[PDB]
Design a protein around this ligand. Structure first.
Ligand SMILES: Cc1cc2nc3c(=O)[nH]c(=O)nc-3n(C[C@H](O)[C@H](O)[C@H](O)COP(=O)(O)OP(=O)(O)OC[C@H]3O[C@@H](n4cnc5c(N)ncnc54)[C@H](O)[C@@H]3O)c2cc1C
Ligand SMILES: Nc1ncnc2c1ncn2[C@@H]1O[C@H](COP(=O)(O)O)[C@@H](O)[C@H]1O
Lengths: 246, 307
């Protein structure tokens, strides 16, 4: 089967988002961008499936601005067979909504003939945690969210999910969308020769209109402010002074 | 009106979450709670007793056992016609089904709403909580999850409204196989007024007990960082942060936690944060109201003893 892997380009998870002092948005202007942590997990799992003769091809897709290509090449470097880049935004500040992304991935998934999709749990930038589900919904497919282990076997998969309380294992029909939790696996690092090799792999630069999708925001962002800065904080000197400071 | 998905588990309604949700949304119209599950009856009862719930709907059917995203999302959508606001507490059960529902109605979803400014203007934390964005849904139906940790669970004395029954629909795309439930005999993390979390500084699963002792002494719930869970010190269920549970008790004691952005995301809203780390430069000491620099293996047991 062909596995589809949606990956996103967003701020480096170690960088503290700075908020412009006029509610415009997070100042992404000069910050280090990288692949969404959850997506690297996704890729790594897809690749693992290939190494067991479950998947034949692995398509990596990313939607956003031109520079997203760097993220795709990183995926190709890890082991992805090919990539597709759907340009939809003209500036890094315009984050496209999970609804738009879902409708695009749905067209891509239908066109490339992918039978399994593996997305991250959530994008560490919008913290939406909704794309995968919206995708399964639009396609009319089963879904396994917050996957910790995926035992794909036959025309169905046994995926144990990281749920409140503990773990919950379910079984879904094969044409399904799976989202990865941070505990699914330990992603590999793209080595120099493979990064160079990745540079010669296919990467189809498409556009949102190619799939006949309107990337208009259902949610107008009126503003975005900095969170409440907490009041100082004292550094005490002994357990007594601690319990004795209320 | 407003349809709200009741947070029920093993036939037992999680009153705290459902309460906080009703409390958050009551200002939008008549709150009507939906209890779906294999044993949703008792839950429906407790649901009705909450102050603000106009009415209660019950969908007790084996088809809703564990609330599989496919069947459940079909239920909600089939009822969505009479509601302009469909919400639920931001729990895994809600996060699994809500987005699917929204897509079916071809409408966006507002995840982890921390403030409802009105019928269509909402506030939600982005970038692991480093920014608060105020959005306005141009949608016809507002589907969203409530960040319970930002509201108060109002209730206990309600008008005991109606308790009806609903139908069904089953797209046979999934089935539940097994469950691995974590033994939690203390205050559930999301509801606790006091939380004591352990990080990597603990070194072992054995030493995590000193964290638990202090917690019991304070009648607090136990939290944990990724490090602690990955190393096997505690079940992932106790993870506080952007990947796990986001709490906001009165007291949050972080012992042996450096204070990584991802961890702060789930506890920067706590009333009083106390940190005890041996590294005077750990990020945690920049958000902690009261911090103590020392060896957790000498301070914690002394703290527990003078409590
Ligand atoms: C996308 C993503 C999501 C994540 N989500 C989460 C999340 O939800 N929650 C979460 O917790 N993490 C999460 N993480 C991991 C997170 O980034 C941090 O790496 C993690 O929180 C660090 O754990 P720690 O503080 O236990 O360990 P460290 O950062 O190693 O800190 C250990 C601390 O122990 C102190 N210490 C050691 N011994 C003692 C002692 N004897 N006495 C006192 N102090 C001592 C040390 O000085 C240090 O401060 C996520 C990561 C990613 C990529
Ligand atoms: N712009 C995008 N491009 C590619 N994949 C995306 C994009 N936005 C979201 N996704 C996928 O959907 C997952 C969840 O994102 P979110 O729904 O925003 O939390 C991401 O981790 C990716 O797998």
């Amino acid at each position: 089967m062909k596995v589809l892997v949606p990956v996103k380009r967003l701020i480096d998870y170690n960088v503290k988002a700075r908020v412009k002092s006029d509610g415009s948005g997070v100042d992404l202007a000069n910050v280090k961008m990288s692949m969404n942590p959850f997506d690297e997990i996704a890729v790594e799992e897809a690749i693992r499936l290939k190494e067991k003769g479950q998947a034949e091809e692995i398509i990596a897709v990313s939607i956003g601005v031109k520079q997203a290509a760097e993220t795709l090449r990183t995926a190709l470097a890890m082991g992805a067979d090919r990539a597709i880049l759907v340009v939809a935004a003209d500036d890094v500040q315009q984050d496209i909504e999970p609804l738009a992304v879902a409708k695009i991935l749905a067209a891509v998934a239908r066109a490339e003939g992918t039978e399994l999709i593996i997305a991250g749990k959530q994008a560490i930038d919008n913290d939406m945690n909704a794309t995968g589900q919206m995708l399964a919904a639009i396609l009319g497919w089963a879904q396994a969210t917050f996957a910790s282990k995926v035992e794909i076997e036959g025309a169905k998969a046994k995926v144990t999910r990281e749920v409140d309380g503990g773990l919950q294992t379910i079984a879904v029909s094969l044409p399904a969308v799976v989202t990865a939790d941070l505990r699914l696996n330990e992603p590999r690092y793209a080595s120099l020769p493979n990064i160079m090799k990745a540079k010669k792999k296919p990467l189809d630069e498409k556009t949102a209109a190619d799939y006949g999708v309107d990337v208009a925001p259902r949610l107008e962002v009126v503003s975005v402010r900095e969170p409440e800065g907490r009041k100082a904080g004292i550094k005490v000197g002994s357990v007594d002074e601690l319990v004795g400071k209320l | 009106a407003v349809l709200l998905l009741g947070e029920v588990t093993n036939g037992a309604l999680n009153r705290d979450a459902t309460a906080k949700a009703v409390a958050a949304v009551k200002a939008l119209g008549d709150v009507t709670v939906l209890c779906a599950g294999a044993s949703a009856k008792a839950a429906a009862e407790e649901a009705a007793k909450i102050a603000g719930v106009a009415k209660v709907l019950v969908a007790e059917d084996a088809l809703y056992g564990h609330r599989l995203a496919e069947p459940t999302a079909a239920l909600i959508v089939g009822l969505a016609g009479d509601y302009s606001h469909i919400a639920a507490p931001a729990t895994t059960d809600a996060k699994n089904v809500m987005p699917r529902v929204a897509a079916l109605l071809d409408v966006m979803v507002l995840s982890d709403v921390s403030a409802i400014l009105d019928a269509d203007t909402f506030e939600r934390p982005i970038y692991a909580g480093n920014a608060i964005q105020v959005v306005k849904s141009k949608d016809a139906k507002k589907v969203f999850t409530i960040r319970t940790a930002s509201f108060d669970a109002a209730g206990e004395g309600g008008t005991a409204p109606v308790t009806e029954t609903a139908a069904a629909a089953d797209p046979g795309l999934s089935s539940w196989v097994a469950d691995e439930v974590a033994e939690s005999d203390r205050p559930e993390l999301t509801s606790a007024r006091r939380v004591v979390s352990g990080g990597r500084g603990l070194g072992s699963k054995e030493s995590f007990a000193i964290i638990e002792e202090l917690a019991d002494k304070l009648g607090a719930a136990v939290g944990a960082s990724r490090a602690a869970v990955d190393s096997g010190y505690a079940p992932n269920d106790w993870q506080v942060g952007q990947t796990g549970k986001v709490v906001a008790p009165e007291l949050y004691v972080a012992v042996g936690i450096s204070g990584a952005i991802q961890h702060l995301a789930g506890m920067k809203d706590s009333k009083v944060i106390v940190a005890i780390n041996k590294d005077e430069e750990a990020p945690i000491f920049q958000i902690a109201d009261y911090g103590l620099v020392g060896d957790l293996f000498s301070v914690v047991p002394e703290l527990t003893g003078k409590l």
